[PDB]
Amino acid sequence: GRLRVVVLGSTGSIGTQALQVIADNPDRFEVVGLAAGGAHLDTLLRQRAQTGVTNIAVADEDIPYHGSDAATRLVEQTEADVVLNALVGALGLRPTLAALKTGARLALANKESLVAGGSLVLRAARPGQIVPVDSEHSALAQCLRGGTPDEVAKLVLTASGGPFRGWSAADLEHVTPEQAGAHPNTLNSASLVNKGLEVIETHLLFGIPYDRIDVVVHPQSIIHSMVTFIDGSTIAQASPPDMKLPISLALGWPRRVSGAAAACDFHTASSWEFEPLDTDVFPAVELARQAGVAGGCMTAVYNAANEEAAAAFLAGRIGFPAIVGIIADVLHAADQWAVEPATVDDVLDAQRWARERAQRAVSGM
Amino acid sequence: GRLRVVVLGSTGSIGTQALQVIADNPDRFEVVGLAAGGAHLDTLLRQRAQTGVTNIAVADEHAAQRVGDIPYHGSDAATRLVEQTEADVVLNALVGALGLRPTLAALKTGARLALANKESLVAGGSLVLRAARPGQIVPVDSEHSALAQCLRGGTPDEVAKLVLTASGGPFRGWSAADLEHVTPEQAGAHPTWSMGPMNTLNSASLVNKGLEVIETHLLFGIPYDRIDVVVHPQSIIHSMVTFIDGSTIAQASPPDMKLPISLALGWPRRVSGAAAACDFHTASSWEFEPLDTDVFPAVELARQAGVAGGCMTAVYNAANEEAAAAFLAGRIGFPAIVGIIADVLHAADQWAVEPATVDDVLDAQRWARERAQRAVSGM
Numbered sequence: 125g126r127l128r129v130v131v132l133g134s135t136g137s138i139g140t141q142a143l144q145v146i147a148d149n150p151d152r153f154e155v156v157g158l159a160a161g162g163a164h165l166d167t168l169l170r171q172r173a174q175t176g177v178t179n180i181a182v183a184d185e186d187i188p189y190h191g192s193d194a195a196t197r198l199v200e201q202t203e204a205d206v207v208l209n210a211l212v213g214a215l216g217l218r219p220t221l222a223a224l225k226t227g228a229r230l231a232l233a234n235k236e237s238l239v240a241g242g243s244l245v246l247r248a249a250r251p252g253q254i255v256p257v258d259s260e261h262s263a264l265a266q267c268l269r270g271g272t273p274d275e276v277a278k279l280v281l282t283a284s285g286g287p288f289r290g291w292s293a294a295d296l297e298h299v300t301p302e303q304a305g306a307h308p309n310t311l312n313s314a315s316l317v318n319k320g321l322e323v324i325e326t327h328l329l330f331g332i333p334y335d336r337i338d339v340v341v342h343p344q345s346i347i348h349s350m351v352t353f354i355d356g357s358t359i360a361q362a363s364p365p366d367m368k369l370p371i372s373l374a375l376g377w378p379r380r381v382s383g384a385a386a387a388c389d390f391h392t393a394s395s396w397e398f399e400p401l402d403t404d405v406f407p408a409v410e411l412a413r414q415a416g417v418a419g420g421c422m423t424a425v426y427n428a429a430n431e432e433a434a435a436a437f438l439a440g441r442i443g444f445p446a447i448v449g450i451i452a453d454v455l456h457a458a459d460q461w462a463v464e465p466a467t468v469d470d471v472l473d474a475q476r477w478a479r480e481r482a483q484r485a486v487s488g489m
Numbered sequence: 490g491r492l493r494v495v496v497l498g499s500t501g502s503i504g505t506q507a508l509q510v511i512a513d514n515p516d517r518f519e520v521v522g523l524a525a526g527g528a529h530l531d532t533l534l535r536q537r538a539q540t541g542v543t544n545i546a547v548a549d550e551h552a553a554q555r556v557g558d559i560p561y562h563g564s565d566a567a568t569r570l571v572e573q574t575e576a577d578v579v580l581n582a583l584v585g586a587l588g589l590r591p592t593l594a595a596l597k598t599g600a601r602l603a604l605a606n607k608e609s610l611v612a613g614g615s616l617v618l619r620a621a622r623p624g625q626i627v628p629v630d631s632e633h634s635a636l637a638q639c640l641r642g643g644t645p646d647e648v649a650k651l652v653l654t655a656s657g658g659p660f661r662g663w664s665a666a667d668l669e670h671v672t673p674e675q676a677g678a679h680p681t682w683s684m685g686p687m688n689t690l691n692s693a694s695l696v697n698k699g700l701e702v703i704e705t706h707l708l709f710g711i712p713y714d715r716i717d718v719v720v721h722p723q724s725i726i727h728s729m730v731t732f733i734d735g736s737t738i739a740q741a742s743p744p745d746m747k748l749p750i751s752l753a754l755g756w757p758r759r760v761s762g763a764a765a766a767c768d769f770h771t772a773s774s775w776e777f778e779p780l781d782t783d784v785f786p787a788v789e790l791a792r793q794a795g796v797a798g799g800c801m802t803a804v805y806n807a808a809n810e811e812a813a814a815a816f817l818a819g820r821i822g823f824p825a826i827v828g829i830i831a832d833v834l835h836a837a838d839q840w841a842v843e844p845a846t847v848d849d850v851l852d853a854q855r856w857a858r859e860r861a862q863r864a865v866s867g868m
């Protein structure tokens with residue numbers, strides 16, 4: 125019994141680390157499909173040559189699946205046990221629903237499909253079929269083996285805090301892309317939107333109310349999240365930052381993969397720091413809670429407004445603090461959007477509306 | 490689903506705290522028995538009055554002329570209480586030698602054993618393990634309780650390492666030369682007729698960690714070479730397990746014995762509101778440093794004793810008590826405590842055999858003490 129794995133977004137960081145794990149564990153896994161956004165052409169051909177897999181999709185015109193929904197066609201067609209969806213942003217919602225319709229495990233890295241899809245994605249899924257790839261949700265799943273659902277008091281997500289811990293909003297006005305770790309996932313870390321995306325994700329996957337989902341800043345990124353139980357016990361998960369750990373566990377769930385990552389080393393001194401998030405300077409998480417509480421298409425809106433505002437920062441059209449400022453403005457104008465999505469088109473409509481309202485805000489800021 | 494609980498050693502700190510948990514949770518727990526040594530009769534008597542529990546035992550032969558009306562009293566009376574009382578959980582918080590036979594009787598009834606008595610595992614470990622079903626024993630101390638919670642994070646073949654944490658004691662960071670002439674008072678030990686000064690000293694010498702390592706091997710069936718100790722001055726994380734994939738799971742809580750007590754009583758179910766949670770609203774730091782094993786050889790020495798097996802950890806602990814008492818009395822220097830344990834272990838080949846009965850554990854302890862007395866007497 126080898127598990128058959130489709131890797132979507134194979135040429136990115138998650139994708140390539142996923143292939144390394146499969147290659148180290150040929151007894152446990154087998155690659156049977158790949159899909160890539162064509163920008164890293166050279167890597168895909170290398171992966172075809174190395175894995176021998178010809179069953180390949182390319183999202184940008186020997187390839188059996190070329191097009192714009194190339195990855196979606198591949199998923200529907202290929203006999204698989206696990207689909208790893210590491211596609212970035214919006215190009216990943218349709219492949220997620222396709223993946224879930226096949227009945228295969230969805231190892232989800234592309235948290236945007238879930239944040240935007242909301243209930244639409246949940247209705248497609250059976251229990252235990254969506255298995256998170258990010259480190260925080262991997263941690264939580266691990267820690268929740270520490271009890272039953274009614275023993276849970278709080279889920280506690282850790283946030284690196286980005287490069288701007290201690291910065292005031294005034295300090296933030298003069299921030300460039302490279303200081304926020306970008307160039308004209310990493311930006312979302314700097315602005316705390318990633319955490320907001322993760323609060324929503326946490327709610328959708330585990331069923332926990334927003335008011336029992338905390339965020340604490342932990343700059344060493346060694347504790348990946350924690351669970352506090354009703355007795356006052358907290359269970360935490362810890363490891364040096366290395367995506368192959370939660371990638372490995374997502375593919376082999378419920379079984380751990382030996383040697384996937386280096387453990388923490390307690391033979392040299394270290395220090396794990398905690399501090400409260402500055403909610404005045406970084407309100408992305410509170411804003412996510414608002415959108416999640418409103419529900420429906422509002423989380424699609426939260427995310428789409430982000431992608432657009434962030435794109436505007438990365439082109440130099442807006443200042444850094446305006447990214448989360450615009451999400452705020454867009455959300456507060458989105459009273460028509462707390463409706464449950466009936467189809468993909470509804471989600472697609474929410475996103476278009478959010479993009480355009482963001483562009484409008486840009487064209488004033 | 491009301492669990493019936495027998496609380497042995499009911500008048501010390503663990504017993505008094507267990508009873509408070511039970512009084513706060515009457516729909517989950519029912520006290521059905523109490524026992525305490527005759528030195529603590531008056532307190533035991535108040536507990537009868539307060540709980541309404543008349544099934545009580547004086548666990549030794551003491552206060553004999555005052556135990557008119559008590560249903561069980563005398564040597565091994567706590568054992569008889571345990572044999573004769575229908576219960577779901579026995580909490581054994583008796584101290585020392587007194588704890589062992591009641592542990593064995595508890596396991597024989599089929600009840601869950603919430604175990605606080607160090608003697609049971611350290612000295613009578615093989616007797617105790619032989620008597621138990623898998624999962625029948627649930628530890629009550631912080632560290633082992635942490636470890637039991639953390640092992641929920643995988644199947645047994647996925648466990649790479651268990652990691653006990655340690656405050657490091659008052660002598661954390663001290664060099665060998667600095668510790669040569671420290672006094673009992675500098676270890677933080679001051680005269681009192683209890684195990685308190687001994688407990689404090691064990692924490693300064695790292696013998697306490699040694700014992701916990703032994704206990705870890707017995708409780709969880711993990712080899713001594715996969716049991717680590719790390720220094721963690723804050724004592725917020727109580728222990729961790731590292732799995733074969735590189736993931737570590739840790740348990741963290743402000744120090745409060747009600748937490749592991751509640752868990753040991755209710756296992757596998759948690760008890761709402763037992764203790765305060767960690768608060769992440771104020772900034773904090775959790776630090777780790779390696780144990781200095783050159784200066785603190787007591788931990789590796791406990792592994793040597795554990796690997797030898799049988800009554801060997803009975804020997805380690807009994808030799809400890811003797812040498813430590815001698816340091817307390819000002820008769821030997823601080824480094825000589827672990828030196829004397831090692832000298833006694835080196836002579837103790839005959840005690841590696843598995844004990845057939847409690848009497849063999851007792852013979853091992855008697856041999857160890859006399860051997861340690863001899864060594865003390867010649868410095």
Ligand SMILES: O=C(c1ccccc1Nc1cccc(C(F)(F)F)c1)N(O)CC[C@@H](c1ccc(Cl)c(Cl)c1)P(=O)(O)O
Pocket residue numbers: 137138257258259260282283284285286309310312313314318319345365366367
């Ligand atoms: O699982 C992870 C993760 C954790 C530690 C380190 C890296 C992580 N993933 C990651 C980070 C950057 C880039 C990528 C990738 F390129 F997609 F692979 C993945 N996340 O979900 C990333 C959130 C966090 C994170 C942590 C550290 C850094 Cl350096 C970054 Cl950029 C993001 P946060 O929201 O700021 O806490």
